[PDB]
Amino acid sequence: MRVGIPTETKNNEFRVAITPAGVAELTRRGHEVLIQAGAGEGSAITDADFKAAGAQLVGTADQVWADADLLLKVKEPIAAEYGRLRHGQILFTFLHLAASRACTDALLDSGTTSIAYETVQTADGALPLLAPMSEVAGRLAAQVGAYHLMRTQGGRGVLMGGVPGVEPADVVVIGAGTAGYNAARIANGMGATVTVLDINIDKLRQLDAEFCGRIHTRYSSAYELEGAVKRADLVIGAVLVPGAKAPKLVSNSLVAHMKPGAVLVDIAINQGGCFEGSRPTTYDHPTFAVHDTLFYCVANMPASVPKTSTYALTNATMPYVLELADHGWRAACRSNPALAKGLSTHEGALLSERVATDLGVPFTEPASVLA
């Protein structure tokens, strides 16, 4: 089949959905790869590098979309991409539908087959394609939090790890999953006092073991959450129920009680945000004021470190890309229950139950379109 990779068009989205090695593996298996010129330049993969690997370098975005049977993107389609979505085409990318009705509508109306990176889930309930992006996001969250805590950035003017004799930043991380563990670890590495909350005690028990008590763990009860946030120089929001709109855990009213110049980073923004006052920002304009605090809500965080994130992503996605290309979406999903869990849309039907309940929209069973 034809596998197409367009240039990413989201704000400051420098990643790409495939690397030369993946292009070379596709063409070894007798597949046709088409790639928009420049598509990899943000990740420092040239058109030449792609050409060498076996790719057909095309001049226009509209051509890739129209030709490609399997389409590989990093981010969700945006407004100007809605007109590109076809029928009988397989879209494989991050989707975050629970967070956007306007996007979900487009995939349904065009009737395209779509599977979502972020809902591919292995038997043990782990999400192996979101994982490395959560990894990148958690780590960015800490340094980005550190940076915006500088007075010069409008923030409070506390240094992350203090210096001997002078107290370090107080960091609160909500969620002990991949993103939250990774944020806590970097922030702790910067010398910050870190507290992680979660409703899953096992997650905290893991964190208690790994850092031998150096990262504080609190059960995410209303009482403990409120107290932590009221105290925090920096709050990082990192919760998730797989493929569901984030719950609202930090109210605007709570934010009014916070230290002036506190920074809040809502990693969960891509799935709705878990702060009441969050709204999607972009790398160009990353922050906005709420009360006396600074909010940071970039939905494509990994985008600023494409050398790292492009390879982190594609290391994980390729085995799944190969199976789609080799066997087609129906057979691939039939042979892989983890791939199947990612099925989002097919011919005007929404195949995720969770996303159907969050949007208030008709759900149809996945196993029903797999026979």
Ligand X SMILES: NC(=O)C1=CN([C@@H]2O[C@H](COP(=O)(O)OP(=O)(O)OC[C@H]3O[C@@H](n4cnc5c(N)ncnc54)[C@H](O)[C@@H]3O)[C@@H](O)[C@H]2O)C=CC1
Hey, which residues between 108 and 147 contact a second copy (CB under 8 A)? Answer: 128, 131-132, 135-136, 139-140, 142-144, 146-147
175 binds a second copy (CB under 8 A): no
> What is the nearest approach in angstroms of ligand X to the Cβ of residue 350?
19
**C-alpha closest to that of 183 among 169, 164, 167:** 169
Q: Which of 187, 240, 263, 350: binder of ligand X (CB under 6 A)?
A: 240
DSSP string spanning 13-37? ----S--HHHHHHHHHTT-EEEEET
Taking residues 285 to 304 in sequence order and writing x for each that binds a second copy by CB under 8 A, - otherwise, the string is ------------------xx
User: Pairing state of beta strands 293-296 and 287-290?
Assistant: antiparallel
Q: Pick from ligand X, a second copy, none: which does 177 bind, CB < 5 to 8 A by kind?
A: ligand X
- Per CB under 6 A, contacts with ligand X among 94-133 are 130, 133
| Residue 319 touching ligand X (CB under 6 A) | no
Determine if 103 is a binding residue for a second copy (CB under 8 A): no
Tell which positions 258-287 bind ligand X, by CB under 6 A.
267-271
**Which single residue is written with the structure tokens 């932590």?**
228
Nearest to 20 by CA among 56, 46, 58, 49: 49
CB distance 261 to 232 below 8 Å: no
Cα–Cα distance, 255 to 303 (Å, whole number) = 28
With CB under 6 A as the contact rule, the residue among 4, 40, 175, 306 that binds ligand X is: 175
Is residue 261 within 8 A of residue 155, CB to CB? The reply is: yes
In the complex, the smallest distance separating the C-beta of residue 115 from a second copy, rounded to whole angstroms, is 19
CB of 140 to ligand X, least distance (A): 8
By a kind-dependent CB cut-off of 5 to 8 A, residue 130 interacts, out of ligand X, a second copy, none, with ligand X
| Using rule CB under 6 A, residue 40 touches ligand X | no
- CA distances for 46 relative to 7, 33, 43, 67, 204, angstroms: 12, 15, 9, 22, 43
Q: Which two tokens stand for residue 194?
A: 């870190």
Nearest Cα neighbor of 269 from 238, 241, 292 is: 238
By CB under 8 A, the residues from 20 to 79 that bind a second copy are 21, 42-44
Residues 133-172 as x/- pattern, contact with ligand X by CB under 6 A: xx--x-----------------------------------
* Whole-number Å distance between alpha carbons of 151 and 94: 35
Handedness of CA 106, 109, 110, 114 (dihedral sign): positive
**Where on the chain is the footprint of ligand X (CB under 6 A)?**
130, 133-134, 137, 174-180, 197-200, 203, 220, 238-241, 246-247, 249, 267-271, 298-302
